[PDB]
Paper text:
Human [name] (hCEACAM1) is a single pass type I transmembrane protein expressed as 12 alternatively spliced isoforms that all contain an N-terminal V set fold of the immunoglobulin superfamily (IgV) ectodomain followed by up to three type 2 constant immunoglobulin (IgC2) ectodomains (A1, B, A2), a transmembrane sequence, and a signaling cytoplasmic domain. [name] function is triggered by intercellular or trans binding of the IgV domain, resulting in higher order surface [name] oligomerization and subsequent intracellular signal transduction. In contrast to other immunoreceptors such as the T cell inhibitory and mucin domain-containing protein 3 (TIM-3), programmed cell death protein 1 (PD-1), and programmed death-ligand 1 (PD-L1), [name] serves as its own primary ligand, owing to high affinity homophilic interactions of its unique IgV domain, as well as an important microbial receptor. The displaced CC′ loop forms a cleft with the FG loop that exposes the key residues F29, S32, Y34, V39, G41, Q44, Q89, I91, N97, and E99 critical in mediating homophilic [name] interactions.
The low resolution (3.1 Å) of the [name] mutant structure limits atomic level comparison with the WT homodimer and therefore provides a more global assessment on the structural properties of the I91 residue. The [name] IgV domain adopts a GFCC′-mediated homodimer with RMSD of 0.6 Å (over 1489 atoms) compared to the WT homodimer with fewer hydrogen bonded (12 vs 17 for I99A and WT, respectively) and weaker hydrophobic interactions (specially for residue F29).
Author numbering:
A (entry chain B), B (entry chain A): 1 to 107
Write the structure that this text describes.
């Protein structure tokens, strides 16, 4: 149900990409974005909490990402390193969290 | 820092095992326990809120689990399908969460 997609799906090097997000839940505490295919705090880019509206970088944060209040993740001056899979956990207050994976390709 | 450890490490099928949890961070708002090596809501056993004490069964819930305020998980009438790996996510209120993976062996 929860999905993410990249606009565009194919991204020239050095140009922008937007990771969009769809079918969020009714009710969420916040979002966590991760590089690659699985939830892992060693590959966390950012945590975001809606109520205070508070982003915090994790270790995988490059400095070129911007998370928006609807979960969307912008990346500018994208690099070969950015290419491929991203992963998004929606955190809920009842601890039953939802997760999604998407990607884009760099050329 | 956050760790988990099985007691006992080897469990006779039909007996009990207790998953001890050490070094909870400060400023957390709940727990998730997942079956396996990875955080993944498809194999979740429970999400638990520490303020309200509500434990919510996930897909991987058997009925034999009991979860404590300090995050420890007891499992009773241990089957063979309970063997191996369990993974813990501590939900932090900055969403810069933490994870831990321990195991046990049935016989
Ligand atoms: C280039 C950066 C501009 C701002 C990025 C935020 C774009 C908004 O984001 C989009 O909004 C739509 C309606 O709210 C939703 O349907 C999409 O799923 C969502 O990701
Ligand atoms: C059947 C008994 C179940 C009661 C809950 C288990 C007791 C809580 O576990 C306690 O916390 C940590 C590991 O869990 C350690 O720091 C402590 O030694 C341990 O007593």
């Amino acid at each position: 149900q929860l999905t993410t997609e990249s606009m565009p799906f194919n991204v020239a090097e050095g140009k922008e990409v937007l990771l969009l997000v769809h079918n969020l839940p009714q009710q969420l505490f916040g979002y966590s974005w991760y590089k690659g295919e699985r939830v892992d705090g060693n590959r966390q880019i950012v945590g975001y909490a809606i109520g205070t509206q508070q982003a915090t970088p994790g270790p995988a944060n490059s400095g070129r990402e911007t998370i928006y209040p609807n979960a969307s993740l912008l990346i500018q001056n994208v690099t070969q390193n950015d290419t491929g899979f991203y992963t998004l956990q929606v955190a809920k207050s009842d601890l039953v969290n939802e997760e999604a994976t998407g990607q884009f390709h760099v050329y």
